Amino acid sequence: GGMLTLIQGKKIVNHLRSRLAFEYNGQLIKILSKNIVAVGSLRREEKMLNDVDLLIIVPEKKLLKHVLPNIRIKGLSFSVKVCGERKCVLFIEWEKKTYQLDLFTALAEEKPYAIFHFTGPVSYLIRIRAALKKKNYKLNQYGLFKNQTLVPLKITTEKELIKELGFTYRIPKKRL
Amino acid sequence: GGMLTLIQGKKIVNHLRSRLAFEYNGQLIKILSKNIVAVGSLRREEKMLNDVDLLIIVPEKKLLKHVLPNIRIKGLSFSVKVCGERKCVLFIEWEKKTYQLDLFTALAEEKPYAIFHFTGPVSYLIRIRAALKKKNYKLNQYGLFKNQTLVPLKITTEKELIKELGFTYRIPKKRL
DNA sequence: GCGATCGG
DNA sequence: GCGATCGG
């Protein structure tokens, strides 16, 4: 995959927002724009991107075996590098060039945790996870755990999650 | 990668044996046939293969950062799917079809352990490892360990390793 | 730091 | 059963 500017990346995401779908036992099911979240380097507003990173929110557990493994993009040429239920990496043709499209899935109840994980950057996640690990917590893209048991937090958004975890809220661009 | 017959796989390995090399700070270093071992489904003599599996024996630790990351195959078209110091997955062109070639590296002192691991099958490895784990040992492709410490066994071959571990020696085809 | 999807 | 490369 070629490198992209932030603007090229945003243009691609805009194009993709109305064109993603998946095949479910023969039936083409459209993925809704509101369930597509730009994450990664794109959400961090970095100047150059190495890929385009999208998080797809899926409404039901049963659908995970179907969404990424049967992903469809209307009108766009692509090939699959690797693909499972949770991560799918595609190479897409856009104008004269091939770019890497990284797709991830989260269930609705995982959404704040997923956004936080897939936003990164990695250095920042390592620091946050290390501090929580010292207090016997484990944080990942699915939830907050203690002694291998889900800690049910009363949150809906990434911001609420960050504050409930006891860290300073910073906009994605400023996380390091 | 397409599926291959055992015969096709063996023909490919024969071709590759004299044609593998790596670039080391600008110089092309041939890999010797005696340091190339057919492993996996090929060594188990399975009728159909999903890929061709080769283990490359590397004489010095310092060379690991160079071998797979700078692999060269004379006269054969290939592309890299993933590649590190210990695992490299290639797609090769062979008689107008594309196949998957899986390359792994072992240091000389790891060789019997690596052969045993990369031969499998997986079901057999799980059983063997579980039994050793009950006695506080850990077996992997690098050695036999107890309390995170290498158990120095006085062996050279896979057969000697198997017997020293206290299991019945069976030819690769009959391991289950 | 932690998980996905391999790798045998 | 145990480890590698790559995902943020």
UniProtKB/TrEMBL annotation, chains A, B:
GO MF: DNA binding; DNA-directed DNA polymerase activity; metal ion binding
Coiled coil: none
GO biological process: double-strand break repair via nonhomologous end joining
UniProt entry keywords in alphabetical sequence: Disulfide bond, DNA damage, DNA repair, DNA-binding, DNA-directed DNA polymerase, Magnesium, Metal-binding, Nucleotidyltransferase, Transferase, Virion
Localization in the cell: Virion
The keyword DNA repair is annotated on this UniProt entry: yes
EC assignment: 2.7.7.7
Pfam families linked: DNA_pol_B_thumb, NTP_transf_2
Organism superkingdom: Viruses
Domain Polymerase nucleotidyl transferase: 30-113
Reactions it catalyzes: DNA(n) + a 2'-deoxyribonucleoside 5'-triphosphate = DNA(n+1) + diphosphate
Domain DNA polymerase beta thumb stretches: 114-175
One term under GO cellular component: virion component
Cofactor(s) required for function per UniProt: Mg(2+)
PANTHER family noted in UniProt: DNA POLYMERASE LAMBDA, DNA POLYMERASE TYPE-X FAMILY MEMBER
Function: Error-prone polymerase lacking a proofreading 3'-5' exonuclease which catalyzes the gap-filling reaction during the DNA repair process. Specifically binds intermediates in the single-nucleotide base-excision repair process. Also catalyzes DNA polymerization with low nucleotide-insertion fidelity. Probably acts as a strategic DNA mutase, which gives rise to a rapid emergence of variants. Generates mismatched G-G pairs, in that case, the polymerase first binds the deoxynucleotide followed by mismatch formation.
UniProt similarity note: Belongs to the DNA polymerase type-X family.
Protein name (Swiss-Prot/TrEMBL): Repair DNA polymerase X
